[model samples]
Target: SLRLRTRPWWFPIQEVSNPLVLYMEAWVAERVIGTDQAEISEIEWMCQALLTVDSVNSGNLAEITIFGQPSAQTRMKNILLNMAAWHKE
Candidate 1:
């Protein structure tokens, strides 16, 4: 099994070329959607995920969605909105 820090410097982001293959959870696919919780040794996970999308998008609009912990979209709504606010500053 591949754990987040199972192997240090495991993600080969720069090792591949064109027709980019990414993993979020972006492994073995193009832009993989993953859970942000419950991955062992994931201290820097969010930063990596952020640049992962940022790098891929470059200047183009990226497609994405968020899933709140079921029925909590009302409270979690602000969670998603905060991301967009930072997307500005």
Candidate 2:
């Protein structure tokens, strides 16, 4: 017999509080706040950074890793901060 157990109300909150996700969100917020770029929305930029993270984790892209220690999330935040500066935007 398979009995289903109900998840606690705090389960979702606990899941959402991962350090990596929090850092990512904070990094995105810092990047998108001061930008006046009309070509893309802040959400778009946030998504782009998230995708970049995906790429890094999968060994597909090398930009951030090249510039900073691959194992450091702090380096990733720094990498995101200077992303536009490096892109000539």
Candidate 3:
């Protein structure tokens, strides 16, 4: 008989990319919805699921979605809008 030890759920799984997706999703939710609180969770989940597909091999769009700051007002708004409307590659 072989025994396998059970690890805690907190133990990180390198293959699961949800954390990265969550990071970007949180930012998008904040920027796009701006604390409106209505339908924001749905938007967050949608964004996370969409972007998480190829998250690792993702391109510049991912970079913009991840770390690109939008302090320039219009610049930021456009970026956020793009993410809100992204689809079909």
Write the residue-wise lDDT of candidate 3 on 1-89 in tens digits.
54343333533354233222222443344444454643643443333311111224243223222211223223444545576666212
Which one is best on TM-score?
Answer: 1
> What number of backbone clashes does candidate 3 have, counting pairs of residues 3 or more apart or in separate chains?
0
Every model's TM-score:
0.25, 0.22, 0.23
* Candidate 1, 11-84: lDDT as tens digits: 34442232222222223212222345354125224323212232244443443332223233233334334544
Error at 68, model 2, angstroms:
14
User: Scored by Cα lDDT, where does model 2 land?
Assistant: 0.36
Off by over 4 Å in 2: 1-17, 21-71
Q: Rate the local accuracy (lDDT) of all candidates.
A: 0.32, 0.36, 0.35
lDDT of 2 at 78: 57
lDDT per residue (tens digit) for residues 1-89 in model 2: 44243333423333323334322333344354344644333433333322122223343333321111224445446545676455445
In candidate 1 the C-alpha lDDT for residue 31 amounts to 23
User: What is the Å distance of residue 48 in model 2 from its true position?
Assistant: 19
Residue pairs of candidate 3 with colliding backbone atoms: none
Pairs that collide, model 1: 22-26, 23-26, 23-27
